[PDB]
């Protein structure tokens, strides 16, 4: 958690969805799990700005490790999670029990 | 307002702009450079605008964005290329040969 990616969360009738803006990270390097109700989204984003940093005239993009945690309702079925990314948005879908 | 974050690097032969534009296909990001000013513009939709009341957390920014970056006179607008991966658009702007 040296940066805190934005995550929206919705509870539909029969599932939750979390949508995490994680640009610049392959969805396979993002770990999504639920442990005792806590949905965590964790990984480490690398950034070009850590390489030849002095050649940057601006560095706005955050990166490094992240670890987002959400205490989702007990209805979230922790054995149902899927996560798939497109264009740096990770969409995590979790059925309700 | 969504102000997508950008880093900009000056390499020996090129400037490189890296923009975090998650949730947009790269082909939908308009990149233009005119008068030494590199512009990125586009629009992102968000799921949060649909059935907003079912969201228990909303923080992702979306809607239109347009940022402009004046670059050194060395940058050559005509040579720009851009490629996107995982929501990051990397724009490469070559430098003009020396006068």
């Amino acid at each position: 958690a040296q940066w805190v990616p934005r995550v929206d969360i919705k509870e539909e009738v029969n599932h939750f969805v979390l949508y995490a803006d994680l640009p610049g990270i392959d969805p396979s390097q993002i770990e999504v799990q639920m442990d005792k109700g806590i949905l965590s989204i964790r990984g480490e984003r690398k950034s070009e700005s850590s390489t030849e940093t002095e050649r940057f005239s601006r560095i706005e993009r955050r990166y490094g490790s992240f670890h987002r945690r959400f205490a989702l309702p007990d209805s979230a079925d922790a054995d149902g999670i899927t996560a798939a990314g497109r264009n740096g948005v990770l969409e995590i879908r979790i059925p309700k029990r």
Side-chain angles (χ1 to χ4, degrees), chain A:
Chain A
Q2 78 219 135
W3 68 297
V4 181
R6 302 260 197 217
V7 181
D8 297 340
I9 299 172
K10 125 169 125 165
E11 181 179 342
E12 287 283 353
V13 174
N14 56 202
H15 62 289
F16 295 84
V17 189
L18 296 92
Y19 303 86
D21 282 341
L22 289 170
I25 312 149
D26 277 329
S28 68
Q29 297 298 296
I30 301 169
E31 177 170 8
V32 175
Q33 63 190 47
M34 274 190 72
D35 187 38
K36 296 297 195 248
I38 301 302
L39 185 289
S40 291
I41 307 173
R42 178 160 208 194
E44 186 179 352
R45 176 186 180 169
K46 304 293 190 202
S47 174
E48 297 86 348
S49 71
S50 60
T51 291
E52 299 170 358
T53 305
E54 65 284 359
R55 286 188 166 282
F56 286 75
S57 59
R58 88 180 44 219
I59 298 174
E60 300 169 354
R61 299 186 317 156
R62 292 170 175 149
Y63 56 107
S65 62
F66 55 91
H67 187 173
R68 304 297 281 105
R69 286 182 155 248
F70 305 100
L72 290 181
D74 295 352
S75 62
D77 179 355
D79 291 315
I81 298 172
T82 49
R86 188 159 188 260
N87 299 130
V89 173
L90 185 71
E91 181 171 321
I92 292 164
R93 297 170 77 77
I94 309 180
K96 285 183 176 169
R97 300 169 191 290

